[PDB]
Amino acid sequence: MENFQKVEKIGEGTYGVVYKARNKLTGEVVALKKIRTEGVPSTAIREISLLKELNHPNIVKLLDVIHTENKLYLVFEFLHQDLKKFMDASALTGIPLPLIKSYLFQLLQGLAFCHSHRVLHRDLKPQNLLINTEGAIKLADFGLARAFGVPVRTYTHEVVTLWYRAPEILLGCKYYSTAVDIWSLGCIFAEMVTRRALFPGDSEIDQLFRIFRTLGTPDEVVWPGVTSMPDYKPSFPKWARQDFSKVVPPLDEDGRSLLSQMLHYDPNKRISAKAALAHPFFQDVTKPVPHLRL
Ligand SMILES: NC(=O)c1cc([N+](=O)[O-])ccc1NCc1ccccn1
């Protein structure tokens, strides 16, 4: 805008371009997101505005929502790096388990908070998990999906990742629950551990089948109601479930146990963020500081 000073382009978001900017007045450095559109649904304005009150240490703070010239700018707290960049940078030696655990623990606190205030993320991915030099990790873009539907592309040619999408979403369920975020986080947890995406689908069906090939094709036994879901097809191949120890080696049994509960097919059986925080996997949780090259 005019009150800022575009420091640099932080890239293209899932709605619009994002700039690192400095408030000419407060002097604070922020992340400015330009959201796609001819008028901007006031329903979305109200929704988005409610999020300015969703404040938690593990949630990227939404500082301001500015609707002007029928344009929508979201002003966010700035963090220097995202988990996707950090995982790539740690790819050779992998992120230490104490840090993986700290991050997972903080992310779960963030989800617990959001979920208790009835706010879902719906599109969690390494790219929207931001970290700082103090060992903190925070969830970015919470609640935006609900206030901006679900578009195939960002808004202008760009393939949205399906890798972290919950199976109920892929089977066409129309009502999402807090469980979709636990699923995405489980996928992210597995990726930090193995240093490779758990389910790197390149199409919705490839995503679904990759999930099926690893966790077994779901049936009425493990997921009551699954065969009645909108996109379920009796013709889906039936793959047997793979041993978990083969999925995220060499994670210990505490870790494997928690991951398995975060990846339960039935959204209802899937562990909640609150319950997850009490899992024995976090018994020795600490807050290490990462090695960040900025
Ligand atoms: N809120 C933010 O700080 C932020 C926002 C978005 N975004 O797309 O909304 C993307 C990245 C961010 N920071 C990480 C970062 C910042 C600068 C250089 C490298 N990496």
SS (H, E, C) the chain: CCCCCEEEEEEECCCCEEEEEECCCCCCEEEEEEECCCCCCHHHHHHHHHHHHCCCCCECCEEEEEEECCEEEEEEECCCEEHHHHHHHHCCCCCCHHHHHHHHHHHHHHHHHHHHCCCCCCCCCHHHEEECCCCCEEECCCCCCCCCCCCCECCCCCECCCCCCCHHHHCCCCCCCCHHHHHHHHHHHHHHHHCCCCCCCCCHHHHHHHHHHHHCCCCCCCCCCHHHCCCCCCCCCCCCCCCHHHHCCCCCHHHHHHHHHHCCCCCCCCCCHHHHHCCHHHCCCCCCCCCCCC
11 lines ligand 1 (CB under 6 A): yes
The phi and psi torsions of 234 (rounded to 5 degrees) equal -60, -15
Contact 145, 36 (CB under 8 A): no
Q: Is 123 a catalytic residue?
A: yes
**Whole-Å CA distances, 241 to 115, 117, 190, 195, 246:** 30, 35, 17, 22, 11
Residue nearest atom 16 in ligand 1 by C-alpha distance: 80
Beta bridge partner(s), residue 35: 72
Amino acid, res. 205: I
- How far is Cα 60 from Cα 52, in angstroms, rounded to an integer? 10
Q: How would you classify residue 43: left for phi > 0, otherwise alpha for psi between -120 and 50, otherwise beta?
A: alpha
Residues 48, 50, 55, 61, Cα dihedral to 10°: 20
Closest atom, ligand 1, to C-alpha of 76? 1
Give the C-alpha separation, 178 to 194, whole Å.
25
Q: Tell me, what amino acid is at 236? A: F
Strand partners of residue 237: none
How far does residue 18's CA lie from ligand 1's centre (Å)?
A: 8
17 forms bridges with which residues in the sheet? Answer: 12
Rounded Cα distance, 294 and 290, in Å: 12
Q: Is the preceding peptide bond at 250 cis, omega within 30 degrees of 0?
A: yes
Cβ atoms within 10 Å, residue 250: 10
- Residue spans of the domains in the chain: they are 1-80, 81-291
What CA–CA distance (Å, rounded) separates 126 from 130? 8
Using CA atoms, how far apart are residues 268 and 9, in angstroms rounded to an integer? 41
> Ligand 1 mean position to 262 CA, how many Å?
27
CA angle (273, 277, 278) in 5-degree steps: 125
Closest CA to 163 of 143, 182, 188: 188
Angle, nearest 10°, between helix axes 97-116 and 179-194? 170
* Backbone dihedral angles phi then psi of residue 75, each to the nearest 5 degrees: -105, 120
d(CA 90, CA 96): 9
Please state which architecture CATH assigns to domain 1-80. Answer: 2-Layer Sandwich (3.30)
Q: How far is CA 114 from the centre of its chain?
A: 13
For residues 270 and 179, is the Cβ–Cβ distance under 8 A? Answer: yes
CATH topology of domain 81-291: Transferase(Phosphotransferase); domain 1 (1.10.510)
Give 256-293 as a 3 state SS string: HHHHHHHCCCCCCCCCCHHHHHCCHHHCCCCCCCCCCC
Q: How far is CA 257 from CA 52, 182, 235, 238, in A?
A: 36, 14, 31, 24
* Backbone dihedral region for residue 283 (phi beyond 0: left; psi -120 to 50: alpha; all else: beta): alpha
Contact call for residues 61 and 113 (beta carbons, < 8 A): no
Judging by beta carbons within 10 Å of its beta carbon (0-12, 13-18, 19+), is residue 7 exposed, middle or buried? middle
* Exposure of 108 in the CB half-sphere (CA atoms within 13 A): 24
Q: Cβ(10) to ligand 1 under 6 A?
A: yes
